Design a protein around this ligand. Structure first.
Ligand SMILES: [Mg+2]
Ligand SMILES: [Mg+2]
Ligand SMILES: [Mg+2]
Ligand SMILES: [Mg+2]
Ligand SMILES: [Mg+2]
Ligand SMILES: [Mg+2]
Ligand SMILES: [Mg+2]
Ligand SMILES: [Mg+2]
Ligand SMILES: [Mg+2]
Ligand SMILES: [Mg+2]
Ligand SMILES: [Zn+2]
Lengths: 136, 116, 85, 45, 122, 107, 23, 97, 95
RNA sequence: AAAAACUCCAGUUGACACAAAAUAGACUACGAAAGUGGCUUUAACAUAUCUGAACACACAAUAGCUAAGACCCAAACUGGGAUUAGAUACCCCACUAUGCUUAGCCCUAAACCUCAACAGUUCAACAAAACUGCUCGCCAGAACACUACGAGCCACAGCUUAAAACUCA
């Protein structure tokens, strides 16, 4: 019976969260990379609420691109969102990285409720030429 | 269902250019590739996370760490017993997947031949 | 950019099953062939070597499909030997 | 016989005075081309 | 040959929509086209955001026309609709059914190729 | 250089061109269609001018005139695209075959 | 297969280029 | 005197036709504790697994009716100049006698 | 002599298989049919092994999909949400 | 891993290119080859016996030169930072020539599928089974030699053609 597809502004959406519709719920942004991951919290109407990262948490070069720093930054941003008064959150992820999976669990343990996860990762259709393959 | 390979390779009777150029000659061997390990075991990440948390809060207070450290030891023991379980399971035989040894047995009992 | 957000390549959590949602996300995206594409596009790969790798993948697919076919075809034969002698 | 079709369809072809009627009729009317197909191959709207 | 103009206007009221339509078909007649018929797709919300000559529009009005005209009329109408801002989009295409649909006898079974390698014990 | 208003080939045997509307006549004019209609009309014109037995494509001179009109079409294509070396080679090979068949016809 | 032939030719061509740019 | 061509034209197999989804009665000649092999017709016997339902009524001389797909299981692979076989025939049973 | 075989056609031949759209026509405007054969999540066109139709019709339908995409009748990223409750023909496994 | 570099830095949202065109493509189509796989239009893809110019003509991947321009990205060179005893490189950061559109030039590649075109048939080893009738082209030990000389070319550190002397088994 459960519909895995997300709701649409056109009716009908038979599921609210905290007595709220899907659209107005705040959105969390994760930008994952091999060297570091960056996390942010924003309102449904573009207003940023909280922002953190492994660098802001105080991790060095080798430690920025890890899962533990991701979990700590997630805990931090979730604490910020809860202090602001945000219970639910819509996840958005961008790119691969070590702490990609870790940020969500960090947020959950911090005390946020993830509703949906969207893979808003960039994809070029042969647009630009990346760097050449390095030889090690 | 399989993709056809009429004129993908460089043949005499194939006028157009070839598409495929495999390094080895495509002959179905009577031996199957044995399975492989996936990655290096890792566990207790959330346990050690909550442990470092309560540590930095309580200044290494064991009576307050009790629950974190108990959960960590229990998860470590679970990982160890799960390793032993999956080892005995792989030895006795993977359920749902077909074993390489008996695959080779079947293929040597009914082997294919490229020649006549 | 112009397309609207929260429609494509999404997963709705049910009963707070975040790990299952992420697993289904990986499953669908790997079946559609995106993560491989992006980890390949990370660094630029020349046309000749890309063509070689793609031919290698085609040959591997055909070989493994034939292997699975013969396995499913002859697995029924593997049973208790009725005629010992 | 093929000439028969496009010859009589000249009356259906709009003109200068028929424009301010056909344009209005078309913009008042609605048309949709969408139609799906099931497993066995039957058209469904 | 036949030419189908798929046209997308902005979501606006019937008077100015009819004005744009009558001026477009007047341009057709000036170029020398002969319209077979007009098909209204209707007003619908565009799937992805677009940018007009000076603005953006999320909704639109889909219309369709089919006509007979020479070749230079095609480029003349393309440049006309590019210059015109009331026309969000205008696209000429050939007719699919004008190309005779080749009779289809079904999918033939492909037998597995053999004699790839010579008879060698190896 | 036939006129543009000349109706299609296939619609010449039919006597319905007098009764049919002038708009339909214009539609059936070759200027509405592509250049191949004009090409075949010119082929028929050269046939009626030259050949003793029409609708005989197997004839050497029929092939010659067909390839000649094709060569003029390629010429126009080349003056439209000075860059198209593919069609340049096509024209050169066509005129080579044309000279070959011209000399064998002379023989 | 072995490539000593083209290796010799490569080395000789390299030396020729060097001498050309020198003289 | 009777020609083999006549005996074949009058054979049970030429009137049987394709074995695809055609009921046939057969019996077993060898049976392992878990499976039974029915001798039904033609060259090959068809192997089968005993169903847990009515599993007791499976002994020598049992007349079981069942459908089938082919008389011999074969398949041609890539490097198979001759198609490999199984010396068996696939068949599905839904009743006895 | 009369009982001997004879060269003859194969009446046991099952008729040639035709895809569901082998005989039907497809155009760039049938947004429903053109979004039927495409990923709802990623928006990419499914391969032939997932689709199960002849190559000519596969080429035609993918060309029409790309044409509708570039024209504006259909997007490239996300399938139209209204056409998700349609008959599912392409065989999947993730569910 | 680290160093260096920027903080006019980093993240969301709204607008924007002369840049190249996922998936389909597990498709085998076109073109003589080189190549062509985002969309629409135009013109158009030779010869209904075969072969055939290295005394000709026409193209000829990428790279490069000539004069205008275009600036996301990448990158020779170069500079800097790592590492090394040393590193004129492999690791990292910045950028130019250049990759692109015009009017030309240069005319070379593992230009290989190293398997010539046409019409056909059923064993040295390896590779992609053995072959038949005719035709053009190519080859006669290695290296000297994609060299010297000569001849031609809008080429001037070049390209095409191509030896000789001496040494060896
Ligand atoms: Mg090899
Ligand atoms: Mg592809
Ligand atoms: Mg030559
Ligand atoms: Mg250049
Ligand atoms: Mg530059
Ligand atoms: Mg090549
Ligand atoms: Mg060669
Ligand atoms: Mg030749
Ligand atoms: Mg060279
Ligand atoms: Mg020389
Ligand atoms: Zn079909």
């Amino acid at each position: 019976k459960f519909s895995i597809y997300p709701p649409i502004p056109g009716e009908e959406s038979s599921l609210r969260w905290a007595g709220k519709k899907f659209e107005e719920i705040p959105i969390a942004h994760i930008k994952a990379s091999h060297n570091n991951t960056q996390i942010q919290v924003v309102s449904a109407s573009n207003e940023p609420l909280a922002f953190a990262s492994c660098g802001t948490e105080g991790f060095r070069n080798a430690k920025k691109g890890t899962g533990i720093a991701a979990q700590t930054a997630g805990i931090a941003a979730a604490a910020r969102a809860k202090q602001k008064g945000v219970i639910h959150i819509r996840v958005v992820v961008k790119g691969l990285g070590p702490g990609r999976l870790s940020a969500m669990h960090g947020l959950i343990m911090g005390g946020l409720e993830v509703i949906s996860i969207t893979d808003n990762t960039p994809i070029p259709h042969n647009g630009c030429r990346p760097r050449k393959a390095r030889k090690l | 269902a399989t993709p056809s390979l009429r004129g993908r390779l460089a043949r005499f009777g194939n006028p157009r250019k070839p598409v495929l150029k495999p390094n080895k000659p495509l002959i179905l061997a009577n031996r199957v590739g044995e399975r492989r390990r996936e990655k290096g075991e890792a566990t207790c990440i959330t346990e050690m996370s909550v442990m470092m948390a309560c540590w930095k809060q309580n200044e290494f207070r064991d009576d307050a760490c009790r629950k974190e450290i108990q959960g960590f030891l229990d998860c470590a023991a679970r990982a160890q017993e799960a390793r032993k379980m999956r080892s005995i399971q792989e030895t006795l035989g993977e359920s749902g997947s077909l074993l390489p040894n008996k695959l080779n047995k079947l293929l040597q009992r009914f082997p294919n031949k490229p020649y006549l | 950019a112009k397309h609207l957000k929260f429609i494509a390549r999404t997963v709705m959590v049910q009963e707070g099953n975040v790990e299952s949602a992420y697993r289904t996300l990986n499953r669908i995206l790997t079946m559609d062939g995106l993560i491989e594409d992006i980890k390949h596009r990370r660094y630029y790969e020349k046309p000749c070597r890309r063509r070689q790798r793609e031919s290698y993948e085609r040959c591997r697919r055909i070989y493994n499909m034939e292997m699975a076919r013969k396995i499913n075809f002859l697995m029924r034969k593997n049973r208790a030997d009725p005629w010992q002698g | 016989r093929e000439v028969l079709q496009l010859q009589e369809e000249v009356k259906n072809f709009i003109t200068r005075e028929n424009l301010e009627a056909r344009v209005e009729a078309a913009l008042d009317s609605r048309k949709n081309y969408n139609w799906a197909i099931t497993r066995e191959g039957l058209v469904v709207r | 040959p036949r030419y189908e103009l798929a046209l997308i206007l902005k979501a606006m009221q019937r008077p100015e929509t009819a004005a744009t339509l009558k001026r477009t078909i007047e341009a057709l007649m000036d170029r020398g086209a002969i319209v077979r018929d007009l098909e209204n797709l209707g007003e619908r919300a565009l799937p992805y955001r677009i940018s007009a000559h000076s603005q953006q529009h999320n909704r639109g009005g889909y219309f369709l026309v089919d006509f007979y005209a020479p070749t230079a009329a095609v480029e003349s109408m393309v440049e006309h609709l590019s210059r015109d801002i009331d026309v969000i989009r205008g696209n000429i295409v050939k007719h699919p059914l004008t190309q005779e649909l080749k009779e289809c006898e079904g999918i033939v079974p492909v037998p597995l190729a053999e004699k790839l390698y010579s008879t060698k014990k190896r | 250089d036939p006129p543009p208003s000349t109706l299609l080939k296939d619609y010449q045997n039919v006597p319905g061109i007098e009764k049919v509307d002038d708009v339909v006549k214009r539609l059936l004019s070759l200027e509405m269609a592509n250049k191949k209609e004009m090409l075949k009309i010119k082929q028929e014109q050269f046939m009626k001018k030259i050949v003793a037995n029409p609708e005989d494509t197997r004839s050497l001179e029929a092939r010659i005139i067909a390839l000649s009109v094709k060569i003029r079409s390629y010429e126009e294509h080349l003056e439209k695209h000075r860059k198209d070396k593919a069609h340049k080679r096509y024209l050169l090979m066509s005129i080579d075959q044309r000279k070959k068949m011209l000399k064998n016809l002379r023989n | 297969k072995n490539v000593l032939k083209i290796r010799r030719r490569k080395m000789n061509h390299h030396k020729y280029r060097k001498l050309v740019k020198k003289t | 005197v009777e020609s083999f061509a006549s005996m074949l034209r009058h054979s049970p197999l030429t009137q049987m036709g394709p074995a695809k989804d055609k009921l046939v009665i057969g019996r077993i000649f060898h049976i392992v504790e878990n499976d039974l092999y029915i001798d039904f017709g033609g060259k090959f016997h068809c192997v089968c697994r005993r169903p847990e339902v009515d599993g007791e009524k499976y002994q020598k001389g049992t007349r079981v009716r069942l459908r089938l797909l082919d008389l011999e299981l074969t398949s041609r692979f890539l490097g198979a100049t001759t198609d490999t076989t199984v010396l068996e025939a696939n068949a599905v049973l839904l009743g006895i006698q | 002599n009369e009982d001997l075989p004879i060269s003859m056609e194969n009446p046991y031949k099952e008729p040639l298989k035709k895809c569901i759209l082998c005989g039907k026509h497809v155009d760039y405007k049938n947004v429903q049919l053109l979004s039927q054969f495409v990923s709802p999540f990623t928006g990419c066109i499914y391969g032939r092994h997932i689709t199960g139709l002849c190559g000519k019709k596969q080429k035609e339908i993918t060309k029409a999909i790309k044409r509708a995409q570039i024209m504006g009748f259909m997007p490239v990223t996300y399938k139209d949400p209204a056409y998700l409750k349609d008959p599912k023909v392409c065989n999947i496994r993730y569910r």
